[PDB]
Design a protein around this ligand. Structure first.
Ligand SMILES: O=C(CNCCc1c[nH]c2ccccc12)Nc1scc(-c2ccccc2)c1C(=O)NCc1ccccc1
Length: 330
């Protein structure tokens, strides 16, 4: 089997992408944020504290003839911004772009933090990191991809995120029309639960390429590119008037600037992120100070190849017995 679904930016900045997901019988369609940096499929629901729902579409398990309460199971997650959600668990039929998994754990939120409440366009998350990170207790659950894998024509999914435009998530096949040249594959470590790999270096603009190993994760659920302070300083040094602002929370630059591209290595191959991808707009409405899309990972503890990086590529998440990652230009 295979599936194919369009993923759509939630706003003009590409702050996140949402993909429609069918849950239950009759289908309930929710717009989920596909997240290769976590492993829980959690949704706004009929159980969510009413004051914490502000425009989201909710999953109502009582209206699904295939929903079953996973007795005694609970879940609780928090992320690096200090956002969180928690609740109980149903199993139900979940379909993505024509690919159906029966018996998928659907984590129904009883509580969500303010950041999620305020994002009316995101109805939940669909995790695609390794199932070792799933938070359900006392019986850990498998991700959608893990449940689908053995049914897929090939044990892969691909992320083809657009820049200010829709893109695609495919399951079970590689669309050879969606990229240019070749896919370069690189090794993955699953030890932290993530699609963790090592970039071979970087370049700023038309600058010479620096060969250096940069370990990080391929994370569709993180907006920006978080890299070591040395690398990030070298980038912003090529932007007149750019500075790191502790009051704003990172590197800012004059909105009148033209940003240089950023290149990262994949083996002997190179992926170029155009400068426009690195512009995240005014720090506040009407400001002439713009927020940068490349930021330091120094307080995080891991480097994160988020959407700013991934949207410059066609990315293969290869879930074979030894997983790997593939990158192609497009
Ligand atoms: O959690 C994910 C992917 N799920 C995102 C869900 C989500 C969290 N608010 C959301 C809001 C909307 C949609 C999805 C999400 N990736 C990872 S691995 C390590 C960190 C981390 C650890 C410590 C410190 C910082 C990052 C994160 C992280 O928190 N990224 C987002 C971020 C990146 C930079 C700064 C803050 C948060």
């Amino acid at each position: 089997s295979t599936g194919s679904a369009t993923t759509t930016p939630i706003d003009s900045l590409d702050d996140a992408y949402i993909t429609p997901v069918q849950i239950g019988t009759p289908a309930q369609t929710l717009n989920l944020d596909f997240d290769t940096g976590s492993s829980d499929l959690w949704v706004f629901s009929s159980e969510t504290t009413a004051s914490e729902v502000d425009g989201q579409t909710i999953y109502t398990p009582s209206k699904s003839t295939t929903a079953k309460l996973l007795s005694g199971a609970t879940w609780s997650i928090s992320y690096g911004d200090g956002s969180s959600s928690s609740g109980d668990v149903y199993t139900d039929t979940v379909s993505v772009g024509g690919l159906t998994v029966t018996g998928q754990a659907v984590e129904s939120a009883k509580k969500v933090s303010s950041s999620f409440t305020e994002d009316s366009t995101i109805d939940g998350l669909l995790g695609l990191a390794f199932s070792t990170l799933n938070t359900v207790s006392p019986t850990q659950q498998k991700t959608f991809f893990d449940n689908a894998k053995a049914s897929l024509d090939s044990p892969v999914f691909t992320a083809d995120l657009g820049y200010h435009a829709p893109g695609t998530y495919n399951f079970g096949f590689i669309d050879t029309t969606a990229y240019t040249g070749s896919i370069t594959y690189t090794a993955v470590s699953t030890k932290q639960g993530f699609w963790e790999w090592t970039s071979t270096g970087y370049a700023v603009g038309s600058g010479t390429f620096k060969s250096t190993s940069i370990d990080g994760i391929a994370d569709t659920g993180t907006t920006l590119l978080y890299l070591p302070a040395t690398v990030v300083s070298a980038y912003w040094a090529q932007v007149s008037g750019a500075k790191s602002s502790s009051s704003v929370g990172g590197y800012v630059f004059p909105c009148s600037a033209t940003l240089p591209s950023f290149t990262f290595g994949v083996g002997s191959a190179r992926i170029v992120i155009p400068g426009d991808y690195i512009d995240f707009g005014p720090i506040s409405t009407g400001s002439s100070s713009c927020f940068g899309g490349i930021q330091s990972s120094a307080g995080i503890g891991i480097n994160i190849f988020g959407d700013v990086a991934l949207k410059a590529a066609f990315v293969v998440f290869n879930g074979a017995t030894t997983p790997t990652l593939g990158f192609a230009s497009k």
